[PDB]
Amino acid sequence: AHMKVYLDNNATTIVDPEVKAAMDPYFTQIYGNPNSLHDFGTECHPALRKAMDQMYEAIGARDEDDIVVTSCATESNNWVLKGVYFDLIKNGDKDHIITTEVEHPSVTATCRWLEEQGVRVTYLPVNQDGVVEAHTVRDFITDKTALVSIMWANNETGAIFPVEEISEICKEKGVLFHTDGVQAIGKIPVDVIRAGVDFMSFSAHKFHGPKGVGGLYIRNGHPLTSLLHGGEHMGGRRSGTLNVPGIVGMGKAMELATYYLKFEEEHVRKLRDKLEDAILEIPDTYSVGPRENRTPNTILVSVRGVEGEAMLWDLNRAGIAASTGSACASEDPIMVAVGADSELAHTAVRLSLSRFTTEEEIDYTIEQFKKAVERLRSISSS
Amino acid sequence: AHMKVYLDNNATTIVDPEVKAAMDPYFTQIYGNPNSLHDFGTECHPALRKAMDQMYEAIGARDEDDIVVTSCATESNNWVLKGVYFDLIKNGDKDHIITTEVEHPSVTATCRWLEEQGVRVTYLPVNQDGVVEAHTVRDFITDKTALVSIMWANNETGAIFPVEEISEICKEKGVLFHTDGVQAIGKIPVDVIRAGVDFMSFSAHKFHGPKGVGGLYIRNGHPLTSLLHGGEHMGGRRSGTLNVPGIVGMGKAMELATYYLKFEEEHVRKLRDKLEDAILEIPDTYSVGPRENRTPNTILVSVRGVEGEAMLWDLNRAGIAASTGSACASEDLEANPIMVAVGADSELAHTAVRLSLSRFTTEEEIDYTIEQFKKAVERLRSISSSYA
């Protein structure tokens, strides 16, 4: 019968009960402010130390590097972009920023505002594989380009970007490299020195951490004008009282994410493959992006004659939670990723699994997906 | 002699068990993203609506006004200051900001950075009563002042500022008014329409809410360039996925604060007065700021022979958590020695002990604190040769 099933994990994830249990004491039992000197404030210090160590270990950062705890990855992207604009463009000799058209709104709208501040930005268009290659940014760097900001993995298609090669090209030309790694943590191996990035954004509520806490990785403590001034929190890089429960839960979730990636990647990937094979068995269906360079939990299927929003609605009525993704038509016939702002864009259904997805959920989802496609095709003009 | 007693509530407060219980479901049971269309995401919508309604009712805002949920009051202060700088100074006809020497670092360091961006800032010194009067701001407002930012109540002395009259002077001269009201919620009646304020910052963990959530009140949805761009969260004014547990707990905590305000004015004030009277029984002790204009939970005591930090450490070894406050010596019109508030960056500033109670403070804690405070004063005066 009716069964509630969650497959919109790329938008947000359930908080692991272990993460919530790790967070629980730091509301009422342990509540002191960590910058105070009395025992109430210092009581949480070992927990904060352990959480920061878990984060450093989870992304492979070194001791010279910095990991600043933000409120969200949106804050991290705003901070990196506007700070490099302030440092190298308004008070520097630069005026160019390189990014892609398929970035998160926290990057796109900030860059548009920066364009309103006179900054030249080239949003690199995306290829059939749902990726931007390194030779493109390499051809697009000038002597006045301040920063290259390219997401690690896309949240609609799950396509993984070649971060190491882009970082190499950026280091040779001497321009800083920021990556939006929110879709990378918990789904692909994350080593910020092997990836060669100067800045990385990530968000806890995407790998089963709590909402309201994010992070910014900075390599070797590179100077970046603070977005929040005030006290000397986070080494004087981001003022405001520490979100102690957020930090503790974020550390626990990041450790758990690396653990379930290292031992349990086959389970999420096997179930995703099962679901995708079953869905593509329906005639005139196409999964966007090659699977061998896609995160193990993501499917983006475009159904012909049916509209993506109608499929999402009928699925939600069946208790299945999914999302949308922009795709366009092409030949080589394939459906490919495209910016949401295109006039040739249609909406495909995005299904994103997690380590909590069961095989019963996948069977129910397969049955209901077939049911919804046949039913909505029964009403289509075509 | 050890019993743990928390008297540093102006720095942060314990999360009310009811607030945590209201927050609990929105981690694992109800986790969908509110911006999604499916039932998982929309399940939390009534809770978010109720929390926002609680905030609107708690500060007396109107329906036309806006309450944008930030990550902390530091975010709200940075946002207001840098946004008015961007709107009216860099892309406007203004170049002046008026503030006080006793603001929180989130205001002061931002104003210093804006000074590094060419903005003229007047840090108004504070009067004997530890507040800034409306006629002073009136003398300092010109035709090129973009914003006046004065805290609602001070976190070191607890002195309440005459915010309504300052707002009147600002309305007469047509200048925007922002107040840092973090120390006001739960301690004094807060009506942002009676206060005539244009912006107000507040932080949940100062009134028994969770850390990681704050708020900014804006009058009539006044235009203010966003600090965080991206999606259309909070009416397109502050992007980033909503801190659903933070919002729910903040709303619950603000409702509880408005309920407990008369408790805090009656019983907590009686306990604060007990502690302060007992401390002033010690010779050569001075309470900073008049009590009749002070929040009901705060004492800032200066001791003559002893140094403040050693007193704090001795108190913490006795299990008592307190904080510091800047004070300098002066006289009253009686020509009697009194201790008065001063900015922390003054060279004539010395550290006084700040004790801040909450609705959870017991009379047992207060008796124990009285005994340990006298003990520590006697012990540190006994070791000095200069104390007379």
Coordinates of all heavy atoms in Angstrom, one line a residue, chain A residues 345-373:
Chain A
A345 N 15.2 24.7 -22.3 CA 15.3 23.8 -21.1 C 14.0 23.2 -20.7 O 13.0 23.9 -20.7 CB 15.9 24.6 -19.9
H346 N 14.0 21.9 -20.4 CA 12.8 21.2 -19.8 C 13.3 20.5 -18.5 O 14.5 20.2 -18.4 CB 12.2 20.2 -20.8 CG 13.1 19.0 -21.0 ND1 13.4 18.1 -20.1 CD2 13.9 18.7 -22.1 CE1 14.2 17.2 -20.6 NE2 14.5 17.6 -21.8
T347 N 12.3 20.3 -17.7 CA 12.6 19.8 -16.3 C 12.5 18.3 -16.3 O 11.6 17.7 -16.7 CB 11.6 20.4 -15.3 OG1 11.6 21.8 -15.4 CG2 11.9 19.9 -13.9
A348 N 13.6 17.6 -15.8 CA 13.6 16.2 -15.6 C 13.6 15.9 -14.1 O 13.8 16.8 -13.3 CB 14.9 15.6 -16.2
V349 N 13.2 14.7 -13.8 CA 13.0 14.3 -12.4 C 14.3 13.8 -11.9 O 15.0 12.9 -12.4 CB 11.9 13.2 -12.3 CG1 11.8 12.7 -10.9 CG2 10.6 13.7 -12.9
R350 N 14.7 14.3 -10.7 CA 15.9 14.0 -10.0 C 15.6 13.1 -8.8 O 14.8 13.5 -7.9 CB 16.6 15.3 -9.6 CG 17.9 15.0 -8.8 CD 17.9 15.6 -7.4 NE 18.3 17.0 -7.3 CZ 18.3 17.7 -6.2 NH1 17.9 17.1 -5.1 NH2 18.6 19.0 -6.2
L351 N 16.3 12.0 -8.7 CA 16.1 11.0 -7.6 C 17.5 10.8 -7.0 O 18.4 10.3 -7.7 CB 15.5 9.7 -8.1 CG 14.2 9.7 -8.9 CD1 14.2 8.7 -10.0 CD2 13.0 9.6 -8.0
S352 N 17.6 11.0 -5.7 CA 18.9 11.0 -5.0 C 18.8 10.2 -3.8 O 17.9 10.5 -2.9 CB 19.4 12.4 -4.7 OG 18.4 13.2 -4.1
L353 N 19.5 9.1 -3.7 CA 19.4 8.1 -2.6 C 20.4 8.5 -1.5 O 21.2 9.5 -1.6 CB 19.7 6.7 -3.1 CG 18.9 6.1 -4.1 CD1 19.3 6.5 -5.5 CD2 18.9 4.6 -4.0
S354 N 20.4 7.8 -0.4 CA 21.3 7.9 0.7 C 21.6 6.6 1.3 O 21.0 5.6 0.9 CB 20.7 8.9 1.8 OG 19.9 8.2 2.7
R355 N 22.5 6.6 2.3 CA 22.8 5.3 3.0 C 21.7 4.8 3.9 O 21.8 3.7 4.4 CB 24.1 5.6 3.9 CG 24.0 6.7 4.9 CD 25.2 6.6 5.9 NE 25.7 7.9 6.2 CZ 25.7 8.5 7.3 NH1 25.2 8.0 8.4 NH2 26.3 9.8 7.4
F356 N 20.6 5.5 4.0 CA 19.4 5.0 4.7 C 18.3 4.4 3.8 O 17.3 4.0 4.2 CB 18.8 6.2 5.5 CG 19.6 6.6 6.6 CD1 20.4 7.8 6.5 CD2 19.8 5.9 7.8 CE1 21.2 8.2 7.5 CE2 20.6 6.3 8.8 CZ 21.3 7.5 8.7
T357 N 18.5 4.5 2.5 CA 17.6 3.9 1.5 C 17.6 2.4 1.6 O 18.6 1.7 1.6 CB 17.9 4.4 0.1 OG1 18.0 5.8 0.1 CG2 16.8 3.9 -0.9
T358 N 16.4 1.8 1.6 CA 16.2 0.4 1.7 C 15.8 -0.2 0.3 O 15.4 0.5 -0.6 CB 15.1 0.0 2.7 OG1 13.8 0.3 2.2 CG2 15.3 0.8 4.0
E359 N 16.0 -1.5 0.2 CA 15.7 -2.1 -1.1 C 14.2 -2.2 -1.3 O 13.7 -2.2 -2.4 CB 16.3 -3.5 -1.2 CG 16.5 -4.0 -2.6 CD 17.2 -5.4 -2.6 OE1 18.0 -5.6 -1.7 OE2 17.0 -6.2 -3.5
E360 N 13.4 -2.3 -0.2 CA 11.9 -2.1 -0.3 C 11.5 -0.8 -0.9 O 10.6 -0.7 -1.7 CB 11.2 -2.5 1.0 CG 11.5 -3.8 1.7 CD 12.9 -3.9 2.3 OE1 13.6 -2.9 2.6 OE2 13.3 -5.0 2.5
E361 N 12.2 0.3 -0.4 CA 11.9 1.6 -0.9 C 12.2 1.6 -2.4 O 11.4 2.2 -3.2 CB 12.7 2.7 -0.2 CG 12.4 2.9 1.2 CD 13.2 4.1 1.9 OE1 14.3 4.3 1.4 OE2 12.7 4.7 2.8
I362 N 13.3 0.9 -2.9 CA 13.6 1.0 -4.3 C 12.6 0.2 -5.1 O 12.2 0.6 -6.2 CB 15.0 0.4 -4.5 CG1 16.0 1.4 -4.0 CG2 15.3 0.2 -6.0 CD1 15.9 2.8 -4.5
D363 N 12.1 -1.0 -4.6 CA 11.1 -1.8 -5.3 C 9.8 -1.0 -5.4 O 9.2 -0.9 -6.5 CB 10.9 -3.1 -4.6 CG 12.1 -4.0 -4.6 OD1 13.0 -3.8 -5.5 OD2 12.2 -4.8 -3.7
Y364 N 9.3 -0.4 -4.3 CA 8.1 0.4 -4.3 C 8.3 1.6 -5.3 O 7.4 1.9 -6.0 CB 7.8 0.9 -2.9 CG 6.6 1.8 -2.8 CD1 5.3 1.3 -2.7 CD2 6.7 3.2 -2.8 CE1 4.2 2.1 -2.6 CE2 5.6 4.0 -2.7 CZ 4.4 3.5 -2.6 OH 3.3 4.3 -2.5
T365 N 9.5 2.2 -5.3 CA 9.7 3.4 -6.2 C 9.7 3.0 -7.6 O 9.1 3.7 -8.5 CB 11.0 4.0 -5.8 OG1 11.0 4.4 -4.4 CG2 11.3 5.3 -6.7
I366 N 10.3 1.8 -8.0 CA 10.2 1.3 -9.3 C 8.8 1.1 -9.8 O 8.4 1.5 -10.8 CB 11.0 0.0 -9.5 CG1 12.5 0.3 -9.3 CG2 10.8 -0.7 -10.8 CD1 13.3 -1.0 -8.9
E367 N 8.0 0.4 -8.9 CA 6.6 0.1 -9.3 C 5.8 1.4 -9.5 O 5.1 1.5 -10.5 CB 6.0 -0.8 -8.2 CG 4.5 -0.7 -8.1 CD 3.9 -1.5 -7.0 OE1 4.0 -1.0 -5.8 OE2 3.4 -2.6 -7.2
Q368 N 6.0 2.3 -8.6 CA 5.2 3.5 -8.6 C 5.7 4.4 -9.8 O 4.9 5.2 -10.3 CB 5.3 4.3 -7.3 CG 4.0 4.7 -6.8 CD 3.0 3.5 -6.5 OE1 3.4 2.4 -6.2 NE2 1.7 3.8 -6.8
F369 N 7.0 4.4 -10.1 CA 7.5 5.2 -11.2 C 6.9 4.7 -12.5 O 6.4 5.5 -13.4 CB 9.0 5.1 -11.3 CG 9.6 6.2 -12.1 CD1 10.2 7.3 -11.5 CD2 9.7 6.2 -13.5 CE1 10.8 8.3 -12.2 CE2 10.3 7.2 -14.2 CZ 10.8 8.3 -13.6
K370 N 6.8 3.3 -12.7 CA 6.2 2.8 -13.9 C 4.7 3.2 -13.9 O 4.1 3.6 -15.0 CB 6.3 1.3 -13.9 CG 7.6 0.7 -14.1 CD 7.5 -0.8 -14.0 CE 8.9 -1.5 -13.9 NZ 9.8 -1.0 -14.9
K371 N 4.0 3.0 -12.8 CA 2.6 3.4 -12.7 C 2.4 4.9 -13.1 O 1.5 5.2 -13.9 CB 2.2 3.1 -11.3 CG 1.9 1.7 -11.0 CD 1.2 1.4 -9.7 CE -0.3 1.8 -9.7 NZ -0.8 2.1 -8.3
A372 N 3.2 5.8 -12.6 CA 3.0 7.2 -12.8 C 3.3 7.5 -14.3 O 2.6 8.3 -14.9 CB 3.9 8.0 -11.9
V373 N 4.4 6.9 -14.9 CA 4.7 7.2 -16.3 C 3.5 6.7 -17.2 O 3.0 7.5 -18.0 CB 6.0 6.6 -16.7 CG1 6.1 5.1 -16.6 CG2 6.4 7.0 -18.1

